[PDB]
Ligand binder design. Structure first.
Ligand SMILES: *Cc1c(COP(=O)(O)O)cnc(C)c1O
Ligand SMILES: *Cc1c(COP(=O)(O)O)cnc(C)c1O
Lengths: 352, 358
């Protein structure tokens, strides 16, 4: 059925790594690990940070039967650690698992195991300004077989990273490259979605841009920004101030922060908050008519990323985000910072 | 620059096992292994069949920085092993590597390493009817980092499997296909035309959705006009009399959604050398097929891959309606011919430039 938090074994480290005096390069001393097979879910293990022992014909390495998740744990002023809406990360992880025919589990049980893991490495969580602990739960197929079938053996593991912007980012809008397709798997956080992006990412760095803007369809629809969802604060063609983000139709990943920004903006009710398709045509005109206020990306890595420049077909489009405050961005960050670092009590935060 | 066959180290096993079977579950005693890092390509290693030791943040397991290849080694009557057009598998592997920002290597050097590996496990190659050794070269990223970037560290390894007749007795069973346009394998400007693991993971759910609707494999439709692209892990062919009223063999052209199959190319080359009928690479729609079936113009529909050289198709389930494909009633002449000549070429009965001796 599922692994239990009650059966959790604790093997403490006898070779603890040095704490720092760089995103996802420094790792903590401990990692969660649960195996699945014909018999079912084994006992969950909090083991020291070891290497993985995989069969050369492991489905994870051959047919990309792999999925992951990204959520942050914030140590507040009272020095109590809290996870930001971890339930939505657990929801999206199970939806990913069912898509790749990997074993289903109890969401609340895995959360408790991740809670206990962070409890053990409690000292690894930084309490510095704009710093957190990045949680990386992973589920992979591990059947020793080259058959493209439902894996008989799987492996769920979690690893932690201490992590450390006021600066805006430049985007490359090249329609030649397609991240995901309607009826694809773009709306699941599967490794398969990322491998292809690495070439497109370095093609952006070599054209001056920092991150990629992913266009889809002949009408060149704005979908995502690298590993972030996209928002546009602007006065629409109807002449009404709205916040718009592409809707969940298969190409867009349902971001936890994306959903949090919509929920937060809806509760204000001060301006219109819609999920509608955004085309380059709409933006080029909106920029021409000076209707665009702020463009930004939302992810775990970057909570609210200001966008100042977009390179599209050898022409630089200046986005006037920073000239317009950026009001909405600074507001979102402020309230998120208050919620996350415990300054303001909220139902979203899950205490360790 | 690249690893060399001259620097190849040989660590022999000391526990050779089995030699009895099901596809890609039984493995040989030895495996090739070359590591890449900042310094560059290390010495290539023929080691015993061990497990892999990967960092928990290995790019291969997180961001699917992984690609593979599939080619067969055929032990002839003279008991000499030969690889079927291995150069094209090496070409497609390098094109895959460049797409995922993985290190480029010398194609001829890796082939020589794979040749030496099969030379060591020469006894593992079966000489039974319709049996071969399946070769599985793999290249993965192995940088201990959660950054979505070009991997600083990689790992190239090759493993071997003895495999059985896809069709026992020489006689061939046909397959049922599910044509559901709701599911999309690849997209134009995607990575469908590269043999990357990322392309396959999503197919497993669509494959079991076919099994539970009676069908055996999936037919992948693309676009609003419902273009026939691929069959599961095989390219698709249609032997028929076209609307112009001429007998032709047609397969979807290489435009990003189609993987350039070694066998696909081999069937085109072989049919072109005959010059007995028209051989074209043109888009095939369901409309064209539904009409061609209605007018009884369809002779044979089949899939081509390494696993299945020539797969007969007898049934296609499309919009909750079963389309009968008259492949088996028409011989199948072209299929049986293709298999016969391929079998003669591969098992050494007929000498050909395509075969590479071990
Ligand atoms: C991880 C990721 C995001 C961010 O997800 P959040 O839950 O909002 O942190 C956005 N887009 C893509 C493509 C991603 O992979
Ligand atoms: C692996 C694969 C094939 C087989 O390619 P060959 O080189 O002909 O063996 C065909 N189509 C798809 C989609 C594949 O993934």
């Amino acid at each position: 059925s599922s692994f239990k938090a009650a059966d959790l074994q604790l093997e403490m480290t006898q070779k603890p790594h040095k704490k720092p005096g760089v995103f996802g390069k420094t790792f903590t001393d401990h990692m969660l690990m649960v195996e699945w097979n014909d018999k079912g879910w084994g006992q969950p293990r909090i083991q020291p940070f070891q290497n993985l022992t995989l069969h050369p014909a492991s489905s994870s390495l051959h047919y990309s039967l792999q999925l992951f998740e990204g959520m942050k744990a914030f140590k507040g002023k009272d020095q109590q650690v809290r996870l930001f809406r971890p339930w939505l990360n657990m929801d999206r992880m199970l939806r990913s698992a069912m898509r790749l025919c990997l074993p289903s589990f109890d969401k609340l049980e895995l959360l408790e195991c991740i809670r206990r893991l962070i409890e053990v490495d409690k000292d690894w969580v930084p309490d510095a300004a704009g710093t957190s602990l990045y949680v990386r739960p992973v589920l992979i197929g591990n059947e020793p077989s080259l058959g493209v079938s439902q894996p008989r053996r799987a492996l769920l593991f979690v690893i932690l990273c201490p992590v450390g912007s006021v600066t805006p980012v430049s985007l490359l809008a090249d329609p030649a490259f397609i991240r995901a397709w309607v009826g694809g798997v773009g709306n699941y956080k599967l490794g398969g979605n990322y491998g292809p992006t690495v070439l497109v990412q370095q093609e952006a760095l070599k054209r001056g841009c920092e991150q990629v803007l992913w266009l889809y369809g002949p009408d060149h629809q704005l979908t995502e920004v690298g590993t972030m969802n996209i928002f546009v604060y602007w006065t629409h063609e109807d002449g009404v101030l709205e916040l718009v983000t592409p809707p969940l139709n298969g190409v867009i990943l349902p971001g936890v922060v994306r959903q949090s920004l919509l929920d937060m903006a809806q509760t204000w009710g001060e301006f219109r908050v819609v999920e509608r398709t955004i085309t380059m045509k709409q933006l080029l005109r909106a920029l021409e008519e000076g209707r665009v206020r702020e463009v930004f990306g939302s992810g775990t890595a970057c909570q609210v990323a200001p966008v100042h420049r977009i390179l599209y077909k050898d022409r630089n489009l200046h986005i006037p985000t920073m000239e317009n405050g950026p009001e909405l961005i600074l507001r979102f960050q402020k309230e998120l910072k208050e919620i996350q670092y415990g300054i303001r009590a909220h139902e979203w935060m899950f205490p360790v």
